[PDB]
Each structure stands twice: as C-alpha cells, then as structure tokens.
Ligand binder design. Structure first.
Ligand SMILES: *[C@@H]1O[C@H](CO)[C@@H](O[C@@H]2O[C@H](CO)[C@@H](O)[C@H](O)[C@H]2NC(C)=O)[C@H](O)[C@H]1NC(C)=O
Ligand SMILES: *[C@@H]1O[C@H](CO)[C@@H](O)[C@H](O)[C@H]1NC(C)=O
Ligand SMILES: *[C@@H]1O[C@H](CO)[C@@H](O)[C@H](O)[C@H]1NC(C)=O
Ligand SMILES: *[C@@H]1O[C@H](CO)[C@@H](O)[C@H](O)[C@H]1NC(C)=O
Ligand SMILES: *[C@@H]1O[C@H](CO)[C@@H](O)[C@H](O)[C@H]1NC(C)=O
Length: 283
C-alpha cells in the first residue's frame, strides 16, 4: 500500500509481501529490493541480460518464493543468475527471446529449491541463425548438476521443439506436470513413459502428432494416474489409427477426448475420433 518501503519505479505491499515493477521498461533488476519480498514481478521490462547474482543481496532475499520475469526482453541468462535465493519455488521466464541460456542458469556453481519452472515461448525469432540446438540448450540447463530434483512442474510450450526430450523425463524424478503444448512434435515412438509413476499431467495439444501406435498406448494404458491432453493435433485416420481409436473409446487417461478430430485423409477430415469404427479406418 501507499508508503510501504519500495524501490523507485515499483509498487510494494508489505502485507502481501509483494513487489511489482511491471511495464516500466526497466533495464536492470532494482538494487534496493525490500527483504520482506515473497512475490516479485518484473514483467514487461527491457532487461536484456540477467547476470550472475542478479538477486543476491546482503542480507539475502531469503523469503523470495515466486519470481516472474516474463515478457522482459531477456536474451541472456548467465550462470548463477538465481543464486542466494534459498526460498525460490516458482520461476517464470516466459515470453523472452532467450538466445543464450547458460547451462548453469538454474544450478549455479558448486540442489535448487525450484518446484515450478515456466519456460513458455522462450525460443527467439529467427533462432535458426544459431549453430546450436535450442531444445538442447534448454535441456542442458534443466539437467545441469541434477540440481532440479524437487522440480514438480515444467512448462515448455510454444518453443518449436521437434521432439519430446527423453532425458528430461528420465532425470527429473519429481516431475508431476509437463507442458509441451504448441510445439512441433511428430511422434512419441522412441519415448518411454513406462516408469513415469509420478507424472500426473502431460500437455501435448497443438503439436503435429499423426497417430499413437500400440507401444505408446500400451505404456499409457498402464499409467492409471495420468491425464493427457491431445487437442488439435493433425490426426491421420487410416488403418494405423485403429489401435488408438479402440483405446480412446476405453480410456480415461485422455482429457477432453471428445474434441479430437481427423485432419487426414480428405474423406475423414474433421471427423470425431471417438465416432470412428474399423470401417472408417482403411489404408
Ligand atoms: C507472470 O506474469 C505474466 C504477466 O503478468 C502473467 O501473464 C498472464 O498469464 C495469464 C495466464 O496465466 C494469461 O492468460 C495472460 O494473457 C498473461 N499476460 C501476459 C501479459 O502475458 C503470468 O500469469 C505470470 N505467471 C505467474 C506464474 O505469476
Ligand atoms: C515502454 O516503452 C515503449 C516503447 O519504448 C513505450 O510505448 C511505453 O510507453 C513505455 N512504457 C512506459 C510505462 O512508459
Ligand atoms: C504457438 O507457437 C507459435 C510458434 O512457435 C507462436 O508463434 C505462437 O505465439 C504460439 N501460440 C501461443 C498461444 O503462444
Ligand atoms: C526410468 O526409465 C528410464 C529409461 O529406461 C531410466 O533412464 C530412468 O532412470 C528410470 N527412472 C528412475 C527413477 O529410475
Ligand atoms: C495392441 O494391443 C492391444 C491390447 O488389447 C491388442 O488387442 C492389439 O491387437 C494390439 N495391436 C497391435 C500389436 O497392432
């Protein structure tokens, strides 16, 4: 509220333990952040580079638990950017053209407190100029040091990813919720969901998936506790779709299953998958 201790260009609430420095075209993280802060919003700025120790203060921001840097024109997050935030549970870097994400951005040097990481729409425009894998860069940051052991929720929508990163599933043992919506995934064939006991939610909407084959159906058929989201994929309703349609009619795993429709072939375009039978599915 008015009069609460606050940096210039920010609005603060001591009662809510909240600092908001939003849509202010800031170029650097404010230096005199109040030590009470639990929730810090620094969205809509022009930060460019997040250096090591960008939030490290003396005394530290020991209560800072939620940090939102979405939409702030960050193009580089350096090694150790989030060091000396011992309570940090939720971090949002979405809608930043992150051309340079250090592998040690989340792990620092030398296990992270992070429980939720939101990295939607981080792929820079015209990233193909780079001679490095963007998805690989992000994966390396996720796995470095095995620092992200407590991570329970990961969002990686809208990043032009071409494949489901298998190492993320194998090496983040606490993950409960994974969002890979609005990417360009084409199949799940070489991905194993067999031992993913903790995974409660998997978002694959708006990808380029053609069909799920029996192998994947089998492994999902054996995860009772998952919710999978498959909306707006360009399903190909030919004879290879037969297993998936059979499964879809029986399963409780797929959320919103009534919305799934064929994109191809032409004679099946826009037909609802749950309504199809063996006679519709021919090669
Ligand atoms: C981080 O800050 C952004 C910007 O305020 C929040 O963005 C909004 O998110 C909702 C869905 O959660 C959208 O429907 C709005 O359109 C978003 N606005 C913008 C400008 O992107 C975002 O929710 C915040 N995230 C958290 C976890 O605090
Ligand atoms: C931030 O920058 C943009 C373009 O430079 C401008 O339109 C906008 O008014 C600025 N924001 C504020 C709060 O002045
Ligand atoms: C979906 O992904 C595309 C391309 O990566 C992006 O341009 C578009 O903004 C994304 N959609 C949303 C709703 O963010
Ligand atoms: C789950 O299986 C994969 C691939 O077979 C393996 O790499 C991973 O370590 C297993 N997970 C656990 C927690 O042991
Ligand atoms: C796939 O698995 C199901 C399980 O009921 C089975 O009935 C079906 O014939 C199998 N299809 C294959 C291997 O194409």
């Amino acid at each position: 509220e008015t009069g609460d201790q606050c940096p210039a260009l920010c609005e603060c609430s001591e009662a809510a333990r909240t600092v908001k420095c939003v849509n202010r075209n800031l170029t650097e993280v404010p230096t005199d952040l109040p030590a009470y802060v639990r929730n810090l919003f620094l969205t809509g700025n022009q930060l460019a580079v997040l250096p090591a120790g960008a939030f490290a203060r003396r005394p530290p921001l020991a209560e800072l638990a939620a940090l939102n840097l979405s939409g702030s024109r960050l193009d580089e997050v350096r090694a150790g950017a989030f060091e000396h935030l011992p309570s940090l549970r939720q971090l949002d870097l979405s809608h930043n053209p992150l051309a340079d994400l250090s592998p040690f951005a989340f792990s620092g040097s030398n296990p992270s407190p992070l429980v939720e990481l939101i990295l939607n729409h981080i792929v820079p425009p015209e990233d193909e100029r780079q001679n490095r894998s963007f998805e690989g860069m992000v994966v390396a940051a996720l796995l470095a040091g095995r620092a992200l052991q407590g991570l329970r929720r990961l969002e990686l929508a809208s990043n032009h990813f071409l494949y489901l990163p298998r190492d993320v599933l194998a090496q983040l043992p606490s993950l409960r919720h994974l969002d890979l919506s609005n990417n360009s995934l084409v199949s799940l064939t070489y991905v194993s969901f067999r031992n993913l006991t903790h995974l409660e939610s998997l978002h694959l909407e708006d990808n380029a998936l053609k069909v799920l084959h029996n192998g994947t159906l089998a492994e999902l058929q054996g995860l009772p506790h998952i919710r999978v989201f498959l909306d707006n994929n360009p399903w190909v309703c030919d004879c290879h779709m037969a297993d998936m349609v059979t499964w879809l009619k029986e399963t409780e795993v797929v959320q919103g299953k009534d919305r799934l429709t064929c994109a191809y072939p032409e004679k099946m375009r826009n037909r609802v998958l749950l309504e199809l039978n063996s006679a519709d599915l021919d090669c």
